[PDB]
Amino acid sequence: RKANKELEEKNRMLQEDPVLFQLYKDLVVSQVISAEEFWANRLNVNATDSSSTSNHKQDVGISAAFLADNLTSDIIESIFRTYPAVKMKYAENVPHNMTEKEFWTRFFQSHYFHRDRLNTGSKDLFAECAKIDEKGLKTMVSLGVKNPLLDLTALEDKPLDEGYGISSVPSASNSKSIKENSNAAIIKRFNHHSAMVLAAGLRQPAVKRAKLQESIEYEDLGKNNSVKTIALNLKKSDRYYHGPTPIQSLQYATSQDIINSFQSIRQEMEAYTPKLTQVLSSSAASSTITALSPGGALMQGGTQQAINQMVPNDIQSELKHLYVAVGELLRHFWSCFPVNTPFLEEKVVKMKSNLERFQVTKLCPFQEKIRRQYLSTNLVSHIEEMLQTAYNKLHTWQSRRLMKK
């Protein structure tokens, strides 16, 4: 059982697959495989179902604001990633002047889920933060990342040297009323939300110049299509012409013999239409029918399939469980064998492999005392042969380690 946690992980793997559970039970009785080792094999996979996550790249807060209905809906998780400040405020309020249940009461409170104030829905507060932070990024903050260019005022020469020229209304602050002013605020929220969606995903002349560098030149001009695909040249085409299967017939004769055979075949072909071959054909047919018919001699028919047992399908299922358990053990022994590195640690790993192989052979002997004695079948001999092959490789490794010593 090792660690109570390792044992629970092994139990979960056994629960997932019925065939695996039977193999695990046989190994536990044998003691060939540790519960921790079984848990490690179960946890020997790639990543998770969603691996990293499933965050959106557009309209993350505008996916289903107060329309889908903490860590409940994936929508609200994407919204938390989209606005870090809103997520931080929610986390701080969780035990301070508010609870999670209280936050849910606020979520469905009137003027929010009911959309009776600030229109929108559950992204109303998010949009308020967006507009405010966009105005702050246009006043207090600016373009933090600004190199040779990558800016706005610096990108367009120097801001707007419009030192009282003729055009200025454009940004007419003194004139913003309510309807048009509200629409301008909505544009600010959308622009900030797009930046926030980019922020959720990852936890200008300079851009144009980089694109120009990518466009300049070609991959073919650099090298070719797939980098530098090396040419393939074969010194001997003759070796391929020769067949791996052994030559069935290989015989020759003298040139004079070839002339004699040609003369006889020329005479034989000219003779034709014997007609009276019926007597020979009738005698030949009588011999052929007996061989061609399934009854009688000269017929190729085997497939005895005489499995005298109680329930053969159940016996086959028991063998499959034994094969799965033995195969997993053989895979572990082969991994240890691959890393030879003849040393003291390698000898310890080889001793562990031997112990597990011997315990698997004891399990095969117990299986022989089961359905190979009661039902007189379960041919565990093949499973024993696979274990013997692993033992033979272990014996070869021991010989190599002795030669190294």
Binding site: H56, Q58, L202, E214, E219, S226, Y240, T245, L319, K320
Partner: protein
């Protein structure tokens, strides 16, 4: 076949889970049409090379789901494609999630074996949890080739991903055009200089029967819904019964390939001689086409590079498609 080709190819197929596949831009719904063409492509890919294997992953709602495990059997992939038609296929697929899992699976596979990923997108818009550009840099570091096929759309991001990994971007202008792209995918691409090339040990398992009428036969069961396996191929390294001859032994890690399968891939090593086509008879040596021993019914002459034997259009098309040899040269 002058360029180096990968004898073992772990091609990976990614199918879009977007609602756009459900929308019928073509006369049939795109998801069903693409899956049917993929089924033909999977069968052709396995037929062209038995050693090469395919793995299918479908991303739905930005979550990666493995439609089929990488395997040498085409039928299992075809069954998974039928299941994909059954699936809702609703919500934007995640390019990042599928690529990350596929790349991790490829990392386990040996560097010398060619590792490739094929992606089909029905929507120009791409939605993923993590930035696509960061993943493309990771793919460049890994020994993986990525080819992206857009459906009736051209995407700069997909082209950039393909060029960086050495893959070729493709556009599905027509269903027939998509079949041609799949035929190009079935053919092995030239091996990159970065890709490792090394001799690989091969185990050849001769089939073992039940000796003489079950003479002390080693009756088995399922050693990678079976019965009593008395007559089966044995892995040479571990002497274990195996149901299918072209299956890599899981415990040994040693690929098992039959001699006829190697003979099939011999044609790939040497390119077929091109046949020059002239509408004019041009004093043709033989009125009868050499291949079918019959006079041409149309004014087309095919001339081989060396033998220069006459070939009719039907013979020329068949020779490239299946024969993979010049009949006049064989004589």
């Amino acid at each position: 076949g002058q360029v180096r080709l990968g004898m073992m190819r772990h091609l990976y197929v990614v199918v879009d889970g977007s609602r756009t596949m459900e929308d019928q831009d073509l006369k049939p719904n795109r998801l069903t049409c693409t899956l049917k063409l993929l089924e033909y492509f999977v069968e052709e890919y396995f037929d062209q090379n038995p050693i090469s294997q395919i793995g299918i992953i479908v991303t739905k709602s930005k979550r990666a789901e493995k439609l089929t495990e990488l395997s040498g059997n085409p039928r299992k992939h075809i069954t998974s494609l039928k299941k994909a038609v059954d699936m809702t296929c609703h919500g934007e697929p995640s390019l990042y999630n599928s690529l990350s899992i596929a790349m991790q699976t490829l990392k386990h596979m040996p560097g010398h074996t060619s590792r490739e990923v094929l992606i089909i997108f029905s929507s120009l818009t791409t939605c993923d949890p993590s930035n696509i550009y960061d993943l493309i840099k990771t793919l460049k570091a890994a020994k993986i080739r990525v080819s992206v096929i857009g459906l009736s759309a051209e995407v700069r991001v997909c082209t950039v991903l393909a060029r960086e990994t050495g893959g070729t971007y493709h556009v599905i202008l027509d269903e027939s055009h998509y079949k041609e792209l799949l035929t190009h995918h079935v053919s092995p691409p030239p091996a990159s200089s970065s890709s490792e090339c090394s001799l690989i040990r091969m185990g050849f398992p001769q089939h073992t029967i039940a000796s003489l009428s079950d003479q002390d036969a080693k009756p088995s069961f399922s050693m990678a819904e079976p019965g009593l396996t008395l007559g089966g191929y044995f892995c040479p390294q571990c002497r274990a019964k195996y149901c299918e001859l072209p299956v890599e032994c899981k415990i040994c890690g040693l690929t098992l390939v039959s001699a006829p399968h190697l003979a099939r891939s011999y044609h790939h090593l040497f390119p077929l001689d091109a046949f020059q086509e002239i509408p004019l008879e041009e004093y043709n040596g033989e009125r009868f086409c050499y291949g079918c021993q019959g006079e041409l019914k149309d004014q087309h002459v095919y001339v081989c590079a060396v033998c220069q034997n006459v070939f009719c259009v039907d013979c020329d098309v068949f020779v490239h498609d299946s024969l993979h040899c010049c009949p006049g040269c064989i004589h």
